């Protein structure tokens, strides 16, 4: 009984052929850098997990990104860091340049290569149909990259991919909720933020692996072709669920539970209703029809699918009709 256990149907294997040091970031031995180095510009912001500064690194006077992380669990931090340093030199993966201890908040001060990002709301309004092939392309090599060296990044979304459109350089930041992938492991699923949530962790499939990626880098897609951010508008998690069955249907979300043997929450009774699945060119009309394909709808019928074994892998991704059009 229970839920019937999933593997990732590609990269399974990474994490145990590699040495534990590579994956086991609680052994990991953090090398300090000199905070004296950075000298901090102008805040940039702060969220729920850090505050990031802009500054100047005083050695060789470039541009640099300090991320001062708030007081968490420690084994969230050294996951943090072994990710970055494992991920480093990928392609599209931000550098991590150095780790210093912060005096003031004494806790570990990341710093980052600076991408001279343009906000989300003003490329959001600007991306021709061709520049959103282009740049989702970019987001795959880093998505591909990641998930064959064993990890899944858990946190997809625009304000995590850091474009600097003058230079047309793309970079996936924000390995803070990433994790490594296990097979047969059972994840916590409050990850993510509530419109990029996969079905696989608002019904609480906690197996879940790399494909919760797919889904995030699809709503991402969606909202950004057909003009309606974000696509799936839930007022709550549950609600989130409802969204999601009024574009997909009710019939493969029941299949999709009932292949793996999971059970709606019951509060699901009052607000699920009957829902049939919808034709993606439904979501067209003329605002929008000029960031729109047939390609376009078919990789997305591909990527926003419940059973996360069902969706495209970023590898198959890449070999998709959508991005023929995109110089490589
Ligand atoms: N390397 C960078 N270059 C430019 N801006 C950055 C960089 N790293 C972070 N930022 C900015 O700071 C914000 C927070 O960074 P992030 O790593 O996502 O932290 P958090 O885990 O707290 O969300 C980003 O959304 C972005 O606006
Ligand atoms: N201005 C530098 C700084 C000081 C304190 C904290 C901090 C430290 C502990 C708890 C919450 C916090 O905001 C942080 Cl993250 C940064
Ligand atoms: N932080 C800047 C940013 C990152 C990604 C996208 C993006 C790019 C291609 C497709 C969808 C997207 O949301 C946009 Cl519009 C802006
Ligand atoms: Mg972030
Ligand atoms: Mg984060």
């Given at each position: 009984?229970?839920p019937?256990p999933?593997?990732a149907?590609?990269?399974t294997?990474?994490?145990?052929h590699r040495?534990?040091?590579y994956?086991?970031?609680?052994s990991?031995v953090?090398?300090?850098?000199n ?9 940039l ?13 005083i ?5 640099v990104?300090?991320?001062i992380?708030?007081?968490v669990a420690?084994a ?12 480093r ?7 991590l ?8 908040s ?11 990002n ?11 149909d061709?520049?959103?092939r282009?740049?989702m392309?970019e987001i ?16 997809v ?11 047309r ?7 803070g ?14 990850v ?6 996969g079905?696989?962790?608002?019904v ?5 692996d ?14 950004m072709?057909?003009?309606?951010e974000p ?10 669920l ?14 999709y ?5 999971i059970?709606?929450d ?5 607000i699920?209703?009957?829902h ?5 060119e ?27 074994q ?13 991005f023929?059009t995109?110089?490589?």
């Amino acid at each position: 009984s229970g839920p019937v256990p999933s593997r990732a149907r590609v990269y399974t294997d990474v994490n145990t052929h590699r040495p534990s040091e590579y994956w086991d970031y609680e052994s990991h031995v953090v090398e300090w850098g000199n905070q004296d180095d950075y000298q901090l510009v102008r805040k940039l912001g702060r969220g729920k997990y850090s505050e990031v500064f802009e500054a100047i690194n005083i050695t060789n006077n470039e541009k640099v990104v300090v991320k001062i992380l708030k007081p968490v669990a420690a084994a969230k931090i050294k996951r943090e860091i072994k990710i970055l340093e494992n991920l480093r030199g990928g392609p599209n993966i931000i550098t991590l340049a150095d780790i210093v201890k912060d005096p003031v908040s004494r806790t570990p001060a990341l710093v980052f290569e600076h991408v001279n990002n343009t906000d989300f709301k003003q490329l959001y309004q600007t991306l021709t149909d061709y520049d959103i092939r282009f740049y989702m392309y970019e987001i795959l090599k880093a998505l591909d990259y990641c998930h064959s060296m064993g990890i899944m990044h858990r946190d997809v979304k625009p304000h995590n991919v850091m474009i600097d459109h003058e230079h047309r350089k793309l970079r996936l930041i924000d390995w803070g909720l990433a994790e490594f992938y296990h097979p047969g492991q059972e994840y916590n699923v409050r990850v993510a933020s509530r419109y990029f949530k996969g079905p696989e962790l608002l019904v609480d499939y906690q197996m879940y692996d790399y494909s919760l990626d797919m889904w995030s880098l699809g709503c991402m897609l969606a909202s950004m072709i057909f003009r309606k951010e974000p696509f799936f508008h839930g007022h709550d998690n549950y609600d989130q669920l409802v969204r999601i069955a009024k574009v997909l249907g009710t019939e493969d979300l029941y299949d999709y539970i009932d292949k793996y043997n999971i059970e709606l929450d019951p509060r699901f009774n009052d607000i699920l209703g009957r829902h049939s699945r919808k034709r993606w060119e439904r979501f067209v009309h003329s605002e929008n029809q000029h960031l729109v394909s047939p390609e376009a709808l078919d990789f997305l019928d591909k990527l926003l699918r419940y059973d996360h074994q069902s969706r495209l892998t970023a590898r198959e991704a890449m070999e998709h009709p959508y991005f023929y059009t995109v110089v490589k």
